[PDB]
């Protein structure tokens, strides 16, 4: 009996880092996607773009070169260590340029990604760990050194950067008993 709140995700003033991605459960409401489909990317997988018990909205910021990694069967630091989509994924991935909001002169270092992890993330897994990464047999003990590196790096978004290294706001809608999210 309520209008589904896509606006609270897409038009959110602030967006999360890819490692610390945010999820919103869309349920008990009416949802229209012709209205949604202003966006660089709008690919639907498992369903037809032209033409579900629960809908999940995952939102994060990545660089434009790394939007391709938000897809089934993709390998890269973002897919491997930050956000993973299942190869059997059914859902829609939408992205847009946020250079106006997410870039700063001197850099915006508040957006970060994981460059180092022991294992590839399982589909739909989140790691917010800030522990030092051991690249070698010698132990780190929470201190940086050889074999010892902080696992997260900063995008450093700057305004006059090329579009590939510029900020992109990505929302992945994941489609998933009864039903509480109905297309009107």
């Amino acid at each position: 009996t309520n209008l589904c709140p896509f606006g609270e995700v897409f038009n959110a003033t602030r967006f999360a880092s890819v490692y610390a991605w945010n999820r919103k459960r869309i349920s008990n409401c009416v949802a229209d996607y012709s209205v949604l489909y202003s966006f660089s990317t709008f690919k639907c997988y498992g369903v037809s773009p032209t033409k579900f018990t629960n809908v999940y909205a995952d939102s994060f910021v990545i660089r434009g070169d790394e939007v391709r990694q938000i897809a089934p069967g993709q390998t890269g630091n973002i897919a491997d260590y930050n956000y993973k989509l299942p190869d059997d994924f059914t859902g829609c991935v939408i992205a847009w340029n946020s250079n106006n909001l997410d870039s700063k002169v001197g850099g915006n270092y508040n957006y970060l990604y994981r460059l180092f992890r022991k294992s590839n993330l399982k589909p739909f897994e989140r790691d917010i760990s800030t522990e030092i990464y051991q690249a070698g047999s010698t132990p780190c003990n929470g201190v940086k050194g050889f074999n010892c590196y902080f696992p997260l790096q900063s995008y450093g978004f700057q305004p006059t950067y090329g579009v590939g290294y510029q900020p992109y706001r990505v929302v992945v809608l994941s489609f998933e008993a009864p039903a509480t999210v109905c297309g009107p």
Partner: antibody
Amino acid sequence: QVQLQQPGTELVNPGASLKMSCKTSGYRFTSYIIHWVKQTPGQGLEWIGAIFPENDDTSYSQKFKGKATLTTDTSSSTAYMQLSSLTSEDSAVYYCARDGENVLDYWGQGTSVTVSS
Amino acid sequence: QIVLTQSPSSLAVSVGEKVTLSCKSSQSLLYSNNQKNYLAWYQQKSGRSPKLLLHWTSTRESGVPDRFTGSGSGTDFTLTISSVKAEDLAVYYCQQYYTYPWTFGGGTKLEIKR
């Protein structure tokens, strides 16, 4: 099929410099650190240093600081060691080894350096 | 720099004999967090590259015969061969990975009596 391949022999004129390769295969080069070890014939194993292929960070023994420079080429998956002002002491077998969960499980066949004119 | 002392440098043993090789460390190789000792054992046979036999003191690698065994904590470590065979003819080295610089022992050359 993790393979570390080194040139078998180098003949170096005394007072000169040599750069020796450690071509790698079967693994992501950036992921694993590469160690360099020296054995003078009839003598034991000496650690020269280690390089991380992702950032090129280096750790060295005191003896090899200023004698050995460790470098990496990401495209060729190759690690390099350069020695300077070669002398009779520099005549030895130099080994490239890969750190892993088991420590130095993977070693190269060796490169034998003869310092002779 | 951690100093690894191996005694003796050379020993000769008959086939079937038990052999205990020793590595003594200047500093403890025990890590409090995992309670594991950062020492590795290598065997170099003549004309060949070094082969890892044991890591973390007691962990045997794949394909290593069960006769090779590792024990020790802190500063004192031992490589034990139960029933040495003639193929066990090699120079055995200990390496520490607890701190950099990484260091190796002088080695023990196992000779066979006949």
